[PDB]
Symmetry: C3
Subunit: 670 residues, 3 copies
C-alpha cells in the first residue's frame, strides 16, 4: 500500500504524513518545512518544526495560520515588569531620532484609578528598555477624575498628545486637551547666529525648530558673545528663526557664519503647551495619530456610548499656529456600527484607517483609504468579524503589515464566545494586505506568538497595541498577562499594585524583520546587573551606595539611621520637614511602656556626659509627660521666660527650690 508524503500545498490534508514523520524522527531533530504551508486537522507538536507554517480551521470555514520557529525572522521581548496594570500602548508608539518609544498607561484597573500616562524606550533597536517614566501626574481633582491618553505622536520636532480627563467612577470623558512639548535634540550646526550691535538679542537660524517662546535652548561654542549655556526662547520670528535674550551687548555686529557650534533642546526643561478643547461633542475616545506634514496631523476617534456610533478622525491642519482648530471626518456610515478605536497612518498622500470591531457576531474590523484626508474613502471589510482588537499597522512597500491579538484564547473567530474567568493562552497574529490588490477576502492571519490571559477578572490587558518601523524592522508593542492573580476577588479588592504580585499585565514587543539586514549582528545576551533604576555601587568600604536622588513615597520602616554631612560645603547634616507642620513622636513600647520617651542629645551617646539633652517622656512612662532639660547652661534668648497661663503655675516647689533669683528689680507682685 503506497503512503503519501506531506505536500505542503495548503490544501492536501498533511496530518497523517506529519504524524508519521514525527513518530519516525528523533524528538531533538528540527524538522524543516521548507517554508511551505501544511494543512492539518489539529495543530501538531509545533516545537519540533522550523521554517514551517500550518493552516488549520479550529472553527470550520475559518482558516488561520500558525508559525513554527524561524518561519518569520522575528522574536518576542518582554519590555515592562512593574506592579501596575500596564496596558494600552494603543495607539501611541513612535520613533524619534533613533529611539523607539512605547507609551502606555499604568493604572490599577481598566479605568483611570492610580493612572499615569507612561513610557518605556529602547536605545538599542528593541533589545533592552528603559525604566518607566511618568508623563502625567494625577489630575488636580483626583480622585474624582484622572488623565487618559490613546493618541500621541510627533510633528515638526514636538510631541503632541490628546490628554483626556475621565471619571474614576465610570471612565466617562469630561475634557479633551491637546498637550505638546519640544522633543530633546542635539544639533551640530554651522553659522546661523547673528547679534546686532548695541543691543542684547541674538537671532538663531534653525530650520523647522518647532520651539515656542519660553522653551529651553542650550548653546555651546557659538562664537557669539552672550549666546552660551542654558537659555530660553524670547521670540519666534518664523518657523526657521527665533531669538534669545543675552546678558550683554557689543559695539560691533556679530555673526558666526562658517563656524561650527552646538544647540540642545529639552523636553524636560520646557513646559507643556496645553490647549483646552473642552468636552468635544460626540466623542468617547481619541485614539491613534497620523503625522500629515510639517504643520499638522490627524487623530482618530470614535463615539460608542449612544446610538449612532461615529468613527473617524480629527485633522489639525496647523497645530503650531492654531492648536484649537480641527475638522471632523467620519468613515462611511455602513462601517460605523459595532466599531471603535481606529488606527490611522499617512503614507505618500494616502490616509489609511483600520477599525476595531466590537462584536464577534456582527461585521467587524474594516480598512479605509483616502486621498483627501478623510473627506472621501474607499473601503473593505475583513472577513469573519475581526473583533475586540485594534489593528495597528505600518506600510512597507506595497503592503500594510498589521498586528492584532485576541484578548483571551479562542475569541478571534467569528461567532466565538468570549472566554473569560479562566487562564488561557491568547493568540497574537499579523497579516499583510497588498494595497494595489485592495481585497481582504483572502487575508492570511498568522499566529506568531501566544500570550497569557490570567483569568482572575473579566478584563484583559492582552493586546491593544501600537506599531512602528525602524530601519528594516517592524515592532508591535502590546500587552500580555502572566498567571499571577491580582486578588481583586481576594485580599486586594482595593487593587493596590504594591501588594503581593500586583497586576499581571505588562508590555511586550514583537520585533519582526521586514527587509534585509546588511550588517553583522548587534545582538547580545544581557548579563549585567540592571543599575539604572536604583544605581548601586559597592563603595571602597564594601557598602552598597546609591548616588542618585530618590523619592520614597510609600510608608518606610528604617533601622539604625545615620544622617551624613551633606549641606553647605558639607558642614552639616540636615533633615527638612514639609507640610503645614512636622511631627516627631514616639510609639507606645510593646514590652516596656513604662519607659516611653525620646532623648534628644547634642552629643553622641545616651549618657548626658556626651552632650546636652532634652528628654520628652510619653504619657505611658511612669513619669508621665515629664520633661527633663539637662545642660551645663540653660540660656533663654530673645524672650521672657513665662508660664503659658496667668497665675496658675509656679517657679519651683517646696521640694524643688531655686537657691535664689538674680533680678535687676524687685518682683512685681499683683
Amino acid at each position: 500500500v503506497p503512503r503519501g508524503s506531506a505536500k505542503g500545498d495548503g490544501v492536501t490534508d498533511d496530518t497523517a504524513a506529519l504524524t508519521s514523520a514525527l513518530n519516525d524522527t528523533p524528538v531533538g531533530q528540527k524538522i524543516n518545512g521548507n517554508g511551505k504551508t501544511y494543512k492539518v486537522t489539529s495543530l501538531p507538536d509545533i516545537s519540533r518544526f522550523i521554517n514551517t507554517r500550518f493552516v488549520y480551521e479550529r472553527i470550520p470555514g475559518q482558516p488561520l495560520y500558525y508559525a513554527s520557529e524561524e518561519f518569520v525572522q522575528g522574536e518576542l521581548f518582554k519590555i515592562t515588569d512593574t506592579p501596575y496594570y500596564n496596558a494600552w500602548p494603543q495607539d501611541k508608539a513612535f520613533v524619534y531620532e533613533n529611539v523607539i518609544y512605547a507609551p502606555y498607561m499604568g493604572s490599577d484597573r481598566h479605568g483611570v484609578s492610580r493612572l499615569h500616562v507612561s513610557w518605556v524606550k529602547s536605545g538599542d533597536d528593541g533589545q533592552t528598555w528603559s525604566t518607566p517614566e511618568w508623563l502625567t501626574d494625577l489630575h488636580p481633582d483626583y480622585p474624582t477624575v484622572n488623565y487618559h491618553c490613546m493618541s500621541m505622536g510627533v510633528c515638526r520636532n514636538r510631541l503632541f498628545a490628546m490628554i483626556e480627563t475621565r471619571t474614576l467612577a465610570k471612565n466617562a470623558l469630561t475634557n479633551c486637551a491637546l498637550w505638546d512639548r519640544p522633543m530633546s535634540r542635539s544639533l551640530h550646526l554651522t553659522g546661523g547666529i547673528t547679534k546686532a550691535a548695541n543691543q542684547r538679542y541674538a537671532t538663531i537660524h534653525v530650520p523647522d525648530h518647532g520651539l515656542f517662546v519660553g522653551d529651553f535652548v542650550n548653546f555651546s561654542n557659538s562664537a557669539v558673545t552672550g549666546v552660551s549655556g542654558d537659555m530660553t526662547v524670547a521670540t519666534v520670528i518664523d518657523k526657521d528663526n527665533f531669538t534669545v535674550l543675552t546678558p550683554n551687548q557689543q559695539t560691533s555686529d556679530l555673526n558666526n557664519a562658517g563656524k561650527n557650534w552646538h544647540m540642545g533642546t529639552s523636553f524636560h526643561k520646557s513646559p507643556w503647551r496645553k490647549t483646552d478643547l473642552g468636552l468635544i461633542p460626540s466623542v468617547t475616545e481619541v485614539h491613534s495619530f497620523a503625522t500629515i506634514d510639517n504643520n499638522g496631523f490627524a487623530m482618530g476617534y470614535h463615539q460608542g456610548d449612544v446610538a449612532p456610533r461615529e468613527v473617524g478622525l480629527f485633522y489639525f491642519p496647523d497645530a503650531f499656529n492654531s492648536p484649537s482648530n480641527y475638522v471632523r471626518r467620519q468613515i462611511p456610515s455602513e462601517y460605523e456600527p459595532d466599531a471603535s478605536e481606529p488606527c490611522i497612518k499617512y503614507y505618500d498622500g494616502v490616509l489609511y484607517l483600520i477599525t476595531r470591531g466590537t462584536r464577534g457576531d456582527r461585521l467587524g474590523s474594516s480598512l479605509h483609504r483616502s486621498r483627501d484626508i478623510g473627506q472621501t474613502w474607499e473601503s473593505l471589510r475583513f472577513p469573519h468579524n475581526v473583533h475586540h482588537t485594534t489593528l495597528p499597522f505600518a506600510k512597507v512597500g506595497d503592503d500594510l503589515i498589521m498586528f492584532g491579538s485576541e484578548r483571551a484564547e479562542n475569541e478571534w473567530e467569528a461567532g466565538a464566545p468570549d472566554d473569560r474567568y479562566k487562564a488561557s493562552y491568547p493568540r497574537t497574529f499579523y497579516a499583510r494586505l497588498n494595497v494595489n490588490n485592495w481585497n481582504a477576502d483572502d487575508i492570511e492571519w498568522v499566529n506568531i506568538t501566544d500570550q497569557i490571559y490570567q483569568g482572575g477578572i473579566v478584563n484583559s490587558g492582552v493586546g491593544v497595541g501600537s506599531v512602528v518601523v525602524k530601519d528594516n524592522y517592524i515592532y508591535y508593542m502590546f500587552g500580555g498577562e502572566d498567571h499571577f492573580n491580582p486578588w481583586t476577588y481576594g485580599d486586594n479588592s482595593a487593587k493596590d499594585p504594591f501588594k503581593s504580585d500586583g497586576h499581571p499585565s505588562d508590555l511586550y514587543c514583537y520585533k519582526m524583520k521586514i527587509g534585509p539586514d546588511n550588517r553583522v549582528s548587534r545582538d547580545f545576551r544581557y548579563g549585567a546587573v540592571p543599575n539604572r533604576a536604583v544605581p548601586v555601587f559597592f563603595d571602597t568600604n564594601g557598602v552598597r551606595t546609591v548616588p542618585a536622588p530618590m523619592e520614597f513615597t510609600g510608608d518606610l520602616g528604617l533601622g539604625h539611621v545615620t544622617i551624613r554631612a551633606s549641606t553647605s560645603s558639607n558642614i552639616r547634616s540636615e533633615v527638612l520637614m514639609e507640610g503645614e507642620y512636622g511631627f516627631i513622636g514616639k510609639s507606645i513600647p510593646t514590652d516596656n511602656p513604662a519607659g516611653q520617651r525620646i532623648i534628644f542629645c547634642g552629643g553622641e551617646g545616651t549618657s548626658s556626659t556626651t552632650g546636652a539633652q532634652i528628654t520628652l517622656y510619653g504619657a505611658n512612662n511612669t513619669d508621665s509627660r515629664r520633661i527633663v532639660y539637662n545642660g551645663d547652661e540653660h540660656l533663654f534668648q530673645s524672650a521672657d521666660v513665662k508660664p503659658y497661663n496667668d497665675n496658675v503655675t509656679a517657679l519651683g516647689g517646696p521640694s524643688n527650690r531655686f537657691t535664689t533669683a538674680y533680678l535687676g528689680s524687685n518682683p512685681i507682685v499683683t
Copy 2:
C-alpha cells in the same frame, strides 16, 4: 585502507570517526548526530554537535550518557540571585492553579543560622521568577534554634508543611509541627448563598473549600445583603459549606440561586494552623510530600543519627479533622542502611519512594512501590551506588522521570572519592524507568547540564532539588554555585550574606519537554527593567520614585533628607520612633569637634530669623553641654518651672539677671 564511519550504536568505539569528522568539518558547522548514541573513550567537543548523545565510561564499568544541545528539548534557567545561601528545594515544589512554586531555604550555611523558609514562583511556565518571599520568621528563641523545612505541598486547597525546629549549634531536631494555610484563589460561582430571615448569618456552598474558622473570605456581587467585601469564616458546617456573620438581617429569606458572583480566599490574610507534634521519636528529617486524596497526604522521613537507620513515610489520613494523627511506615530493612531523604509521590493508587544513598562505596539509592500506602512494598536497587543526591521525580505515562546532581565534579560513580575544596563543574542527570518493566539494571543516566561547585568550603549547595510537571513540561528546581567565594576562610567567617558576593548557592530550574506542545511559542527575551522588587518610576520632575512601602533593616547612611507631607490628609510630615525609647544624637565631628551641636528649628534655615530654635551643644563643643532656647516667646504650659534638685541651682546669675519676676504672691523663702 578503508576507513569506518561512525556507527552510533552505543557499542562500536566511534572515537576515531568522530575525531576525523571534527577535524574535517568547519568549527561553526552543527554536526547532527541523528538522535543516536555514540560510544567514545573520552568526551569530544560536545559544543559542535546537535541532536547527539555520547556514552562514555569515565570509570570503567560505569557507562553514563552525555547530551549535546537539542538532543532533549530542554533548557536551564537561573531562578534566584540573592546573597543568602539559597539551596535545598528538596522536596517542596508544587504547582497550584497555574503557578509553579519553588520553595527553598535561604540561610548563611548548611544549618539554620539566618534561615528563612522561602519561595520564588513562576507565572509564565518557568521563563521568569518572582521576588523571594519569606514564609517563616526567625524562631522566637533564635539564636538557640530556628526553623527548617523539607516537606511541603497542597491538599484540598491548603498548603501543608512540616516546620521543624533545629539547633543552630548542631542542626539537631528539637520539634516537629504541621503548619497549614489556605491557598489564595478566586472563584467565579453561580448560586450557593442563603441567608435565613431575621438572623445575621449566611451559608456559603463551596465544594472542598478547605477553609477553617477565622480564615479570610472576600465576596463580590453576591446578591445577598451583608455578604460583601472582606469577611471571615464564622463556622464550618461540612467540607462543602461554611457560614459568615453579616452585619444585618432582613425579614425575608435570601438565596442567590442562578446568580453569578465571586469569592476570594487569601493565604496572606489567614493565619497558619499550627499543630505541635512534639519531638517525633526516631526522626532526623521530614522530607518530601505526596498528596493521597481529598483528606490527607504522606511525608517522607529518615533517621540517620544513630544505628539502625530508618527510612519511610508518615501518612496523615485525615489532616483536616485530625492533623496530629499519623502512622509510620518504613521501607524494607535491607534498603535502610546508608539511606536518607526519601522522595515520595502517589499516582493511580501507587506510592513510589526513592532514597538518597549516603556512601559511594555501599549500596545506594533504591526505588520502592506500594499499593497500600507503605504497608507492603516491591523494591529495586539502582546499580552503582547512587549517592549524595536525592532523586525527585514525577510519573509521565509509564515512566518515572527522575533527576539528580552530583555535589561536586566526578562524585557520581560508585567508588568515586569526594572531590571538595577546589572549584569544579558537577554533572546533573536525569533518567527514565518504565514501571511495567520494573528493572533498573539497564538505567541510563543522561547528563543534561553542568553546574559549578565553588570549593571555598566543603559543603555544596548543588542539587538536592524538587520536581513538578505542568502541562507538557517537567521542571527540576535545584541548587548550583558560582565561582565567587563566600570568604568563610577569609574575611567573612561570620558568614554575613551582605558582605562582598555573599554566598554562591542559588537556584536553577531545568525545564524539559515531555509531551507535545500544540501551540505557537510563548517564549520571549526579557528586555525589561526588573521593577517588582524596588519599583521605580521617573516622576514628571525627572526623579526616581518608589511608591511601594519598604523596610530597610540594615544600617543606613543618608545624605540630605526631606520628610514630605504624608499624614492626616497630608497636613503633616511625620517620623515615629519605636522601641522603649528613641534617641536622636550627634556624632563627634571629625574636623571641628568644637562645633558639635544640633540646631532644632521651627523654620526653614539655620538662622534663628527663620523660626524658633533650641540648640543642644555637645560635650566636645567649646560651650560644653550648653543649651540655648531662642524664641520670641517661651511659654511653659501645664506645669511649674522647677529645678531638678532642691536648693542647688538658681534663677539667673550675676551676669545674667532677669529684669524682674511677675508673681501673684511674694516668694516662698525657706
Copy 3:
C-alpha cells in the same frame, strides 16, 4: 545560458549567485555557507546565513571579512548597565582563581570628573556579572585632580595597578603611583604552623604568600593554640614564611605537621601599599600589564603630548622588595610616530607589544616581540593604517588572537575620515597572527559584532578594551554605546549621570571559543529577580524588606517614616547626625504658612495627652517664633535657669504671672 553557482573561494565574485539563492529561498531558511568565504560587492542579508564568511572591499584595496551567525562559536554579552560613562577596560582585565575581572573607569566624560576606577566580575565564565565595585575614591584634592588607571594585573597573589593623578581641566598627568594589595584567597593546607614554647609568635609556611606586614590573615582548624580567627601579619621572614602574634604562650613547642587547616587572605581588609613614583618624566599614560615571573611585571606606556613620541614599557624586576625600581624600554624609533597605548603580554619568554595608531592617514598599529624584556625587538607593521583602537590580545597555540573596534562606523580603513556627531553602528573585529610566520601582510580582520556610537558628542566609549583567556574561551571586554543622548548639548551640560538616561557608554564582553569544550553545557537563561544590588525579600507581612546596609548619598525625599528598634539589644530606635552640626528644620508651608511649626513629642500622637511636647513655631506662623513647652513636669537639671542676656528679659509678665517662686534665699537684686 548556463548560470554559475557560488564558489566560496574568496576571489570569484559570488554576488549574483548569492542574490539568486536569496531570491529563490524562503526567508526563514538558514543558508549554510559551509564555512567558506564568499567575495561580494556589497554585504547581502547576513541574517539569512549561518556558518558563512563574506569578504568585501568597502574601500577598494582594503578587504575586510564579515561573519554570519555561527561562523565562529562566540557570543556578545552586555556586562554593565549603569548611568556613569562606563568605558576604558583598556588594558586591565585579568583572571584570578576562577573569576574573570573587567576593570574600567566610570566617569561623566572623557576625563577624570566624577571618576571611580571600578570593576565588574563574572563567577560563571561570563554569563552573568556582578554589581560594580569602586576601587578608588575621589582624590583628596578633587575637583582639581582625580585618579585614572589603564594598567592593572596580578603578580604573586597581589593586585598591582598604576594609579595616576590627572587634572580635571585638561586630563594632564600630575603623578604616578604603584598601588598593590593582596588578593582574597582560601587555602586548604596541611601542616606548616609552628609556635616555639614560652613565646607568643607563630610561623606560618605558605609558599609565595605575597603578603606584607599588616595584611589580613584568617585561620581555622590550625591545631595551634592562639593561631585562630582574624589576625594580621606581624613579620615576613621570606617569600614562603611569615609570622603572626598570638594572644598567649605554652610551655611546649607546637607544630601542626600532618594536620589539615584553612587560611584566608583579604583584599578588602588589607590596606593598599602605595609607592609614589612622582611625575615620571616623558609619560602621557601608563597602559597594559604583563606579568613576567614570581617577582615582577611590565607596564606599557606612551608619551604623546610633545614631539617626539615615545612608546614602550616599564619593567619592575622585583616589585615586592623594590616597587620604586623600574627600567624604561622603548620600541624602535620608526614605530613611535603616531602611536600610543601599547598592549603587552609575556608568553614562553617572549614579550609581545601591539601599538594603537593615532591617524588613519599615516602608518598605524605595529606588533613587536622581544626575548630580553624589551631591550631588542623584531617588528612588523599591520597593513592599512590601523588606528583609533588598542589591540588587546592573547596567545593561544601559535597564534596571537587580537581584538579591535572602530570608534564610529566606517573609520577602520586607511584614509577613512572620522565619522562623528551622528549615530552609527561601529564594527568590532578580531584577527589571528601566526607567530612563526611573523608577517601581517595577509592579515584577515573579521567583523564579529557591531556596536552603537550614539553621536551626541564627538567622543566615543566604543572599544578600547581588554582581553583574557580562561580555559577554552577568550574574552574581549570593551565599551559600546546606545541611542540615548547624554544631553551634553541639551539640558545636561553638567554631565550629571543621574539625570534622564545618564551616559550611554557601557561594557560588553565577546566570549569566543578557542579550543574544545569537553563538558555538557553550563549555559542558562537568566530568569531570576536580580537581588544582589538591593536585596529585597517579601517579609511574612507582605512588605518588601532590604536587610543589607546601604548608603544613599543623593538627595532623598521620604514619606511617612518609622524608625524601628535597632540598637543596644533593640532597646531603642536611633538616629545619629554627622558633620560639625546637625540641623532639623521646617519648610515654609505652601498652603498654610501661618501653621509653620514642628511638634516634638514623647508619645505617639499630635495630642499632648499622648506625651510631653515642645513645639517650635516658624517665623511664618501667626505666633511667630513662639516656643510652647508642654509637660506635666518641667525639670531643669545640672544648671541654673538663666536669660541669655543681662537685665533684658523677665520671669513672667503682667498677663503671665507665676503664682510664686520657691526659693532657699531672698532674691539678689542689683
